[PDB]
């Protein structure tokens, strides 16, 4: 019996021994885990104390905002300094034509106005100095063209996006015999046009070459007229979505009418080279030209559904434009 009984005793002690070792463990762990909730908890507090301090430091700064710099408004002041320079960087003006500037903090008005001026000059220098001389020519050319046409001619707008270029007419098309005759003058621009005679008003294909001295109107190789820039006074054009123009010129041939498929280009390029920029007329009614000598003619423009040039038995030159 004693052996059976002795086991009971030992049985109890183990249970007691492990159980107490377990409770000791559970207790020792609830100690650290929740004593640590009060480590993290004690920081949730002290960061929510700083937060309160910062808000108040800011508002204390504000109330004192007219004071010379000091620890209290140092925060607030540096905040308006900071805020301003950021909120400008976000809202800077897109280019030289953005007048717009944002409204500033009362104190930094004086600074705002310094910055706005600085930014603009920076923008001006940045642009002018980075433009490629190729491009600079194009805008400069385009710019005069707008000056001349914008508003006043029903197809100037459609002209704008299609760039101007050097010669419209061929490496080979100029025919060597004409170049030799042409002399020690070069070709700044050439283009295919269509001539209409004085009397007949009939169609005749020709080439228009622009030399420094003069414009030259050339058949296949025969150079059928030279107009000097001194001898050419003005140019006249219709005000419709037309494609045609007249060259005013003074017992020798005088004015002449022509059509470029590239009209704005040719006409500006000419008026530049010939320095007759201010001497272009844009007629809404009719054009008068000296014509083939002793045979004055008149050109009557009218809108319509198609392009066609013809003469009618008034003797006048009837042009009919399309209309976009």
């Amino acid at each position: 019996r004693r052996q059976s009984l002795a086991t009971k005793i030992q049985a109890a002690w183990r249970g007691f021994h492990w159980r107490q070792k377990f409770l000791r463990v559970k207790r020792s762990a609830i100690c650290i885990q929740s004593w640590w909730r009060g480590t993290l908890g004690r920081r949730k507090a002290a960061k929510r104390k700083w937060a309160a301090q910062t808000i108040r430091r800011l508002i204390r700064g504000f109330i004192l905002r007219h004071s010379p710099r000091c620890p209290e408004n140092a925060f607030f002041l540096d905040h308006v300094r900071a805020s301003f320079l950021l909120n400008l960087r976000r809202q800077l003006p897109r280019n030289v034509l953005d007048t717009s500037w944002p409204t500033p903090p009362p104190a930094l008005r004086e600074a705002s106005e310094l910055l706005r001026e600085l930014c603009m000059k920076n923008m001006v220098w940045k642009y002018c100095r980075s433009i490629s001389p190729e491009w600079k020519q194009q805008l400069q050319q385009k710019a005069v063209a707008s000056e001349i046409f914008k508003g006043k001619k029903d197809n100037y707008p459609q002209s704008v996006p299609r760039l101007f270029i050097s010669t419209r007419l061929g490496t080979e098309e100029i025919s060597p015999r004409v170049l030799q005759s042409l002399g020690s003058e070069p070709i700044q621009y050439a283009v295919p046009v269509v001539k209409y005679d004085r009397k007949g008003y009939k169609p005749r294909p020709r080439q228009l070459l622009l030399t420094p001295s003069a414009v030259v109107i050339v058949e296949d190789a025969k150079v059928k007229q030279r107009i000097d820039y001194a001898n050419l006074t003005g140019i006249s054009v219709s005000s419709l979505s037309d494609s045609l123009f007249v060259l005013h010129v003074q017992k020798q041939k005088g004015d002449v009418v022509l059509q470029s498929d590239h009209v704005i280009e040719t006409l500006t390029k000419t008026a530049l080279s010939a320095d007759r920029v201010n001497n272009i007329n844009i007629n809404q009614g009719s054009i008068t030209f000296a014509g083939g000598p002793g045979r004055d003619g008149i050109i009557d423009f009218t809108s319509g559904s198609e392009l066609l040039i013809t003469k009618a038995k008034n003797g006048h030159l009837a042009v009919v434009a399309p209309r976009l």
């Binding site: 019996r1 004693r2 052996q3 059976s4 009984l5 002795a6 086991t7 009971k8 005793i9 030992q10 049985a11 109890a12 002690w13 183990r14 249970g15 007691f16 021994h17 492990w18 159980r19 070792k21 377990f22």
Partner: protein, 144 residues
């Protein structure tokens, strides 16, 4: 037939000794667990319980069956008096004490025996309380 309150407590210790946490525990573990939950099983009963469930020689024991074992053993456990009676037959002279020599002796030999490491743990625990020897009357009630 099983209380909700009980399942909650037991689950904690199981899951604490369930290091890999598969929902099952080492057979060698099983002793330390039931005792940590406050029981007094014997390696006798352990082996019977371990052998029966671990019929297949997994060496593993899940928590659903673990509730049967705690429940089966809960059905009957030793009151203080029987344990008090248990010492009393090793206390020929009815003074209510026990030499820590006779104690060491009885424990290291007769029953489900204990090492010196174990026995030292029990003698300290069953403290001499002064150079002394081990009144069981105070100690037995203490283990409850």
């Amino acid at each position: 037939q099983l209380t909700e309150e009980q399942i909650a407590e037991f689950k904690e210790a199981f899951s604490l000794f369930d290091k890999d946490g598969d929902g099952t525990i080492t057979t060698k573990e099983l002793g330390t667990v039931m005792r940590s939950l406050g029981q007094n099983p014997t390696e006798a009963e352990l082996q019977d319980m371990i052998n029966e469930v671990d019929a297949d020689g997994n060496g593993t024991i899940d928590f659903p069956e673990f509730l049967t074992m705690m429940a089966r053993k809960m059905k009957d456990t030793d009151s203080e008096e029987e344990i008090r009676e248990a010492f009393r037959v090793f206390d020929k002279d009815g003074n209510g004490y026990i030499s820590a020599a006779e104690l060491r002796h009885v424990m290291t030999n007769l029953g489900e025996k204990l090492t010196d490491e174990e026995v030292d743990e029990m003698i300290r625990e069953a403290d001499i309380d002064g150079d002394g020897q081990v009144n069981y009357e105070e100690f037995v009630q203490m283990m409850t």
